[PDB]
């Protein structure tokens, strides 16, 4: 039921907050450095630090601008916060294998 | 971020947005993208008409030629166009050019 | 052609053919109530383990299943857990990937 940072245990999200974007909470994507990510979309997250200013370049999600989301505790790259869009205006795409799932 | 399509499992290049030709379908128990062209698949078996979602086309199984994952089907025997590829959205990764 | 062996003693435990995508993936990163973090791979079957204890539903990572601790039957290394009492499948194993060694049949 709760998602923590796999590296340090920082509280990040919850299964209840998963968000099916275009029909599915899970999206498999690659960046221009050819890294493949299994991204889980969440309506809400906490315990992150969002770094820099949003950018629309290479956005996987139509109409959204992204900011890099680090673990606020350990600094590990956990995914991205998306904004600037519609329905919803904002959400988080977190890298599923950087999280640890467990009891509430 | 979404002009090239690759195998989800291993990252083999399969197709591109320029070749798109999102059908939601039900097998007899998918969000399929149709493409005019693809690469890096291996098409296996003999074409079959059984439960073909596309009227007048027979299908052949399309595997990723790099790792063997099942990515969708190749359709032949129809008209306008004669042939195309129907790939399973959830088996692809999307990314930049 | 791939089997998983106990990393400590070499006993054959499971097969790659038996990898099971529970909730969409065979790999789950999980944490127990003492905050220990494990990277678990799900298999339908296994062999050469010894399940200890009565099944328990408390804190199960997989809803609708009870768990029992699974040790290597040969050397006693803690390799994961067995799950039972659910449906489709009724039972399966969550094994600690870092405590296995994968290799040819
Ligand atoms: C700006 O060039 C880069 C470089 N050079 C990079 F090394 C990595 C990225 C990167 O991971 N971007 C993600 C951000 C989130 C999104 O939705 N799509 C992406 O593709 C990137 F954009
Ligand atoms: C009963 O309190 C404990 C203590 N004290 C412990 F030190 C470890 C565990 C433990 O590892 N539990 C696993 C069992 C397998 C599963 O699916 N979920 C878990 O959370 C545990 F439950
Ligand atoms: Zn962290
Ligand atoms: Zn592949
Ligand atoms: Zn052993």
Residue numbers in the entry:
A (entry chain A): 20 to 123
B (entry chain C): 18 to 38, 45 to 52, 56 to 123
C (entry chain B): 19 to 123
Give the original sentences from the paper that presented this experimental model:
Nowadays, the E3 ligase substrate receptor cereblon (CRBN), thalidomide’s primary target, is of particular importance in the fields of MGs and PROTACs. However, these CRBN ligands induce the degradation of IMiD neosubstrates and are inherently unstable, degrading hydrolytically under moderate conditions. In this work, we simultaneously optimized physiochemical properties, stability, on-target affinity, and off-target neosubstrate modulation features to develop novel nonphthalimide CRBN binders. These efforts led to the discovery of conformationally locked benzamide-type derivatives that replicate the interactions of the natural CRBN degron, exhibit enhanced chemical stability, and display a favorable selectivity profile in terms of neosubstrate recruitment.
In 11f, the ortho-fluorine may constitute the major design element, but additional decorations at the benzamide scaffold could prove beneficial. Fortunately, we could study all compounds generated in this iterative step through cocrystal structures in complex with the hTBD homolog MsCI4.44 These data confirmed that the preferred orientation of the ortho substituent toward the amide NH was preserved in the bound state of all ligands except for 11b. Sub van der Waals distances ranging from 1.3 to 2.0 Å were seen in 8d, 11a, 11c, 11d, 11e, and 11f. We determined that F and the NH proton are closely spaced by observing correlation peaks between the NH proton and the F signals in the 19F,1H-HOESY NMR spectra of 8d and 11f. The results, therefore, strongly suggest that IMHBs predetermine the ligand conformation in solution. In addition to the prominent scaffold derived from 8d, we investigated two other hits, 11d and 11f.
